[PDB]
Design a binder for these strands. Structure first.
Ligand SMILES: [Mg+2]
Ligand SMILES: [Mg+2]
Ligand SMILES: [Mg+2]
Ligand SMILES: [Mg+2]
Ligand SMILES: [Mg+2]
Ligand SMILES: [Mg+2]
Ligand SMILES: [Mg+2]
Ligand SMILES: [Mg+2]
Ligand SMILES: [Mg+2]
Ligand SMILES: [Mg+2]
Ligand SMILES: [Mg+2]
Ligand SMILES: [Mg+2]
Ligand SMILES: [Mg+2]
Ligand SMILES: [Mg+2]
Ligand SMILES: [Mg+2]
Ligand SMILES: [Mg+2]
Ligand SMILES: [Mg+2]
Ligand SMILES: [Mg+2]
Ligand SMILES: [Mg+2]
Ligand SMILES: [Mg+2]
Ligand SMILES: [Mg+2]
Ligand SMILES: [Mg+2]
Ligand SMILES: [Mg+2]
Ligand SMILES: [Mg+2]
Ligand SMILES: [Mg+2]
Ligand SMILES: [Mg+2]
Ligand SMILES: [Mg+2]
Ligand SMILES: [Mg+2]
Ligand SMILES: [Mg+2]
Ligand SMILES: [Mg+2]
Ligand SMILES: [Mg+2]
Ligand SMILES: [Mg+2]
Ligand SMILES: [Mg+2]
Ligand SMILES: [Mg+2]
Ligand SMILES: [Mg+2]
Ligand SMILES: [Mg+2]
Ligand SMILES: [Mg+2]
Ligand SMILES: [Mg+2]
Ligand SMILES: [Mg+2]
Ligand SMILES: [Mg+2]
Ligand SMILES: [Mg+2]
Ligand SMILES: [Mg+2]
Ligand SMILES: [Mg+2]
Ligand SMILES: [Mg+2]
Ligand SMILES: [Mg+2]
Ligand SMILES: [Mg+2]
Ligand SMILES: [Mg+2]
Ligand SMILES: [Mg+2]
Ligand SMILES: [Mg+2]
Ligand SMILES: [Mg+2]
Ligand SMILES: [Mg+2]
Ligand SMILES: [Mg+2]
Ligand SMILES: [Mg+2]
Ligand SMILES: [Mg+2]
Ligand SMILES: [Mg+2]
Ligand SMILES: [Mg+2]
Ligand SMILES: [Mg+2]
Ligand SMILES: [Mg+2]
Ligand SMILES: [Mg+2]
Ligand SMILES: [Mg+2]
Ligand SMILES: [Mg+2]
Ligand SMILES: [Mg+2]
Ligand SMILES: [Mg+2]
Ligand SMILES: [Mg+2]
Ligand SMILES: [Mg+2]
Ligand SMILES: [Mg+2]
Ligand SMILES: [Mg+2]
Ligand SMILES: [Mg+2]
Lengths: 207, 122, 143, 62
RNA sequence: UAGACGGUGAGAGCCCGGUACGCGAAAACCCGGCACCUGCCUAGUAUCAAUUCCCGAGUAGCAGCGGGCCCGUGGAAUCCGCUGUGAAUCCGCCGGGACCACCCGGUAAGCCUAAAUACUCCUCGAUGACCGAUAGCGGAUUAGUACCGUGAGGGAAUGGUGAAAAGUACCCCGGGAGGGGAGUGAAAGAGUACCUGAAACCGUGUGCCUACAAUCCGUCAGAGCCUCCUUUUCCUCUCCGGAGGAGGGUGGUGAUGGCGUGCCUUUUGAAGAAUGAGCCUGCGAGUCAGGGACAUGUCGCAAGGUUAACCCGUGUGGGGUAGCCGCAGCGAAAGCGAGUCUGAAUAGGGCGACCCACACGCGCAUACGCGCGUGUGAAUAGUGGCGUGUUCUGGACCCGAA
RNA sequence: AUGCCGUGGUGUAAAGCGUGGCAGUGAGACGGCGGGGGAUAAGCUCCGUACGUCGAAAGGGAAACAGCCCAGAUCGCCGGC
RNA sequence: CGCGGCACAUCCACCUUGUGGUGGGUGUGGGUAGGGGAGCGUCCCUCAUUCAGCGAAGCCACCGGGUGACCGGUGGUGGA
């Protein structure tokens, strides 16, 4: 509930209080599962396609006469039983995406963040690199000071181009703005590191 | 996701062709013919696992009849007399005794004859 | 935590039935059975085999429909009493704010329930019983 | 594609406040001279649709 | 600020092309600016008068016959065509769903007009819970080619040595083809018929059975052979190893005995002399769309539930109240409304509302309770998403005519 | 005589009824008993039958032999009646 | 009928005393059209984890295993 803010190359400076109505919600497993499934479904392209017997090239006329040959009745050379013919119930371009209610989405995100906070995986920092120029070496040293786990979600403001670039290509580190937080990314991360102003903005956007 | 069928499809084919070894002609070489032969074979084995229980009783009764008539008594009256005497040995072991220990079988026949009623038509 | 820990609620998702996949399931006719129409096509709901159907041998319902009819959203004095225990003024905006009535519609007050609170209801087209109940309670009913 | 309702069915049936489906009755349009008042009064009014027809009339209305 | 992607003798941020990032244009073309240049503006403003003129003509209107509108000629307005007839210029004319009166709105028969919308032969840059050589375009291969047709047209099949060609010098048999030995290679169990290399099908060798027997070709019983392991009494040569003998067990074969009328489809009934199938391999049939409809399982919120288009965001995130469903019914409707309709009816019916397992006061019965206010604490409910079954409109489970 | 309607007792798990979801079927065959048509012929034809079997029922008997007699296969046993 | 294994339904007693398990009785378990319930195998994606040039996939043989679709172990061939 009470998180202490850490500084790069140094120690604590302040503290932040997490409101319990945003970080102490119970964990609805089924709700989060549905929300995450909807997210991943909307992430698809669905650009698969096939050709039906009406779209395969040629094959318009009846290949030979109906009777008197001793062969099966055929009707077209692009019928699905033919090699090179059409596809029956083949894939067509689709749009996988679901209309999950906003209340369910927000509740799932709140539950995930509450689980993280309850296990103690929420960290708060002032900023990543004390300079104005990016430096992956020092940013990685600072993150390793905070954390010894693989997947880390770094939430920083959209105006911190000096600090986003620093941790941009660190493996296992994911960056997103406070207004783009989502259940999938929170649940994939092991620790969530907030910048102080990013955390305050997220808290203010929910009161 | 397009799926090629071969890897899954051959699993049943191998088992059919492996169980169909020893059949002559297409019935051991071709999967479609071996499948029909396997249907017939497993039905036959089911039928025979229940028929042999009567088959062996038939054989035992034949041998018991031979041994009893050798000892001058019908299988008919030997069975009646053994039940009257209260001997509860079954036909498998009666036939086994008749093959192995004829003296013991003669003793059993004496017991059955003794327990049999004096006039068997009353 | 840990995406490999999310599972759906029991009974929420059940596998679809695949209908042309061998004898141990819906085998070859796929539940159709027949040799007739229903083995290849659907029969329209309106078809009855050739006798006059139910939707054609019955007379049309009598009357017309008024193109010019006015509709009122209704609220009862019992609901008013439940929603405004302290009494006071009761307007159409107050009613829509409390959710007792749809918005942007003409409101008519009906007289079902018990009214005890002194209220000042402004609406359209009061009922006969509603006026009596409101004035017995001690308020007023303006239009 | 949006589902279309049946025009004639919607003209000949309607629902009540509890979801019952009601209809009028036949034989009451003409040739009324030889029909006694008992028969005409019986044919008057509205009746609930029969239980063996309710499924199809519901499908027609929806 | 580079861990994108690919290559290199096997999974490479540090080996290579690159990537983040940052520079770079003689000239041509495009866009923008500034000039040149080109054009327009050389008093009419306001007030009064209310006499006169003007305000788009073969037009409007009307009639006949048609077209198109929710509108299938109908009481048929509005809009468009051909034929006939044929005005008026504001005290005019047209519209407001036959038509008339009043009121309201507008000013036909002249022209031009960006943006928000549709599309991709084509050019660049990305991406894919898309395909991977019978798939994906007809076309990874000479592909609209070969070939077929007079012609319009129709229209294929054919990818993989190896890291590197190091692609087998030399010898031998052979006319050659082909092979054997050498040699290269990690591998020739990779030899230009070349990665892996299944099945049908065809050989060669070998164990058992088979030339006196009537067989849906198997199954149960079953002797005898052969093979390989093991407990015994023996070659005790035994550290041996096992020759053999006796037993047991694997595996192969099956003399002989019983039982036994293929599979599918379709039928009252098929081994059927009814249908389909030569065999193997590959391919080949209930799918998808939609805030569709009905019903159910499950999750969120709950007298409320939910957004659509759209806007902002690298995304799956945040906004967006228009709308929809629930919220009171009855009636042809005016209407009325816990009732309403019919009806002369305070008659009866139709449809619709309305808890008692209980106490308190109350008219109340021996009791049972009849109605009213609360609890003794009396039971409601909808809506959005996601599954599943059925259904609708679409080719709609697949194939097939004349 | 049977059958049918009602009612009071007794018995009986997988009866019955209402309301929804999803069906298939709507070509029947033979045998027993009662009838029509037929010549009181048909492995004929059309009805009845809280009649049976087959259909959709394997096993035993009937030489073989859907519909007749016995009997309804959860699997195993070299047990018995 | 005897002895053993399995399953469905139900009754009787416990463990969450019907989310479901535990113990014992009893009844039931032929099946076409068709209805309902629970599973096997193939491929692709995500998350976690674990094998692989000291040899993956595929294929072949043998030895085993499960109530079924089917599974495992060892060896050979092979080369991601
Ligand atoms: Mg075509
Ligand atoms: Mg055609
Ligand atoms: Mg082709
Ligand atoms: Mg194709
Ligand atoms: Mg949204
Ligand atoms: Mg053999
Ligand atoms: Mg027996
Ligand atoms: Mg079949
Ligand atoms: Mg069905
Ligand atoms: Mg049918
Ligand atoms: Mg039929
Ligand atoms: Mg068919
Ligand atoms: Mg239709
Ligand atoms: Mg007719
Ligand atoms: Mg009339
Ligand atoms: Mg009359
Ligand atoms: Mg790479
Ligand atoms: Mg290299
Ligand atoms: Mg018209
Ligand atoms: Mg008209
Ligand atoms: Mg004219
Ligand atoms: Mg008008
Ligand atoms: Mg004009
Ligand atoms: Mg124009
Ligand atoms: Mg435009
Ligand atoms: Mg091709
Ligand atoms: Mg290939
Ligand atoms: Mg030519
Ligand atoms: Mg070498
Ligand atoms: Mg190799
Ligand atoms: Mg090789
Ligand atoms: Mg070859
Ligand atoms: Mg090869
Ligand atoms: Mg011989
Ligand atoms: Mg014979
Ligand atoms: Mg034999
Ligand atoms: Mg025989
Ligand atoms: Mg026939
Ligand atoms: Mg045949
Ligand atoms: Mg034949
Ligand atoms: Mg025939
Ligand atoms: Mg024929
Ligand atoms: Mg035929
Ligand atoms: Mg044939
Ligand atoms: Mg789907
Ligand atoms: Mg729902
Ligand atoms: Mg109404
Ligand atoms: Mg009434
Ligand atoms: Mg709900
Ligand atoms: Mg039913
Ligand atoms: Mg019929
Ligand atoms: Mg019939
Ligand atoms: Mg008779
Ligand atoms: Mg007769
Ligand atoms: Mg007959
Ligand atoms: Mg007949
Ligand atoms: Mg009969
Ligand atoms: Mg049938
Ligand atoms: Mg039988
Ligand atoms: Mg039966
Ligand atoms: Mg029989
Ligand atoms: Mg049984
Ligand atoms: Mg069964
Ligand atoms: Mg079935
Ligand atoms: Mg190696
Ligand atoms: Mg694979
Ligand atoms: Mg292996
Ligand atoms: Mg291998």
């Amino acid at each position: 509930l009470k998180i202490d803010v850490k500084t790069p190359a140094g120690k604590v400076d302040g503290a932040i209080e997490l409101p319990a109505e945003l970080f102490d919600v119970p964990a609805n497993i089924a709700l989060m599962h549905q929300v995450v499934t909807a997210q991943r479904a909307a992430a698809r392209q669905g650009t698969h396609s096939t050709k039906t017997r009406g779209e395969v090239s040629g094959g318009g006329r009846k290949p030979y006469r109906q009777k008197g040959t001793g062969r099966a009745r055929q009707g077209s050379t692009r019928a699905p039983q033919f090699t090179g013919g059409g596809v029956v119930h083949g894939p067509k371009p689709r749009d996988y995406s679901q209309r999950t209610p906003k209340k369910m989405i927000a509740a799932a995100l709140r539950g995930a963040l509450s689980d993280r906070a309850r296990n103690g995986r929420i960290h708060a920092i002032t900023e990543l690199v004390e300079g104005q120029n990016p430096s992956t070496k020092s940013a990685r040293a600072f993150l390793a000071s905070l954390t010894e786990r693989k997947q880390v979600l770094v939430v920083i403001g959209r105006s911190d181009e000096a600090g986003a670039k620093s941790v941009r290509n660190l493996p296992g580190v994911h960056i997103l703005a406070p207004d783009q937080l989502n259940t999938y990314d929170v649940l994939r991360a092991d620790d969530v590191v907030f910048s102080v102003e990013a955390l305050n903005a997220y808290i203010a956007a929910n009161t | 996701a397009r799926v090629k069928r071969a890897v899954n499809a051959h699993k049943k084919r191998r088992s059919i062709l492996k169980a169909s070894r020893g059949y002559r002609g297409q019935r051991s070489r071709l999967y479609r013919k071996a499948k029909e032969q396997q249907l017939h074979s497993l039905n036959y084995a089911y039928r025979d696992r229940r028929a042999r229980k009567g088959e062996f009783r038939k054989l035992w009764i034949a041998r018991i009849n031979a041994a009893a008539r050798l000892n001058d008594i019908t299988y008919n009256r030997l069975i009646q007399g053994l039940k009257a005497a209260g001997v509860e040995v079954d036909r498998k072991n009666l036939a086994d005794i008749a093959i192995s220990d004829p003296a013991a079988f003669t003793a059993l026949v004496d017991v059955a004859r003794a327990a049999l009623p004096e006039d068997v038509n009353a | 935590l840990k995406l490999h820990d999310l599972r759906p609620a029991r009974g929420s998702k059940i596998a679809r039935t695949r209908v042309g996949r061998g004898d141990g399931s819906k085998g070859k006719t796929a539940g159709r059975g027949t040799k007739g129409t229903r083995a290849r096509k659907q029969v329209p709901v309106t078809f009855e085999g050739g006798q006059m159907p139910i939707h054609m041998r019955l007379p049309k319902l009598k009357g017309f429909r008024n193109r010019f009819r006015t509709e009122y959203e209704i609220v009862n004095v019992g609901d008013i009493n439940r929603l405004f225990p302290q009494g006071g003024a009761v307007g159409v905006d107050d009613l829509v704010a409390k959710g007792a009535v749809r918005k942007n519609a003409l409101v008519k007050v009906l007289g079902d329930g018990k009214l005890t609170a002194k209220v000042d209801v402004s609406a359209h087209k009061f009922s006969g019983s509603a006026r009596a109940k409101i004035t017995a309670a001690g308020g007023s009913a303006t239009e | 594609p949006k589902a279309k309702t049946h025009s004639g069915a919607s003209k000949r049936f309607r629902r009540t406040g509890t979801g019952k489906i009601v209809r009028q009755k036949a034989n009451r349009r003409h040739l009324l001279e030889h029909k006694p008042s008992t028969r005409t009064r019986r044919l008057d009014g509205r009746t609930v649709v029969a239980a063996n027809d309710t499924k199809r009339v519901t499908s027609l209305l929806n």
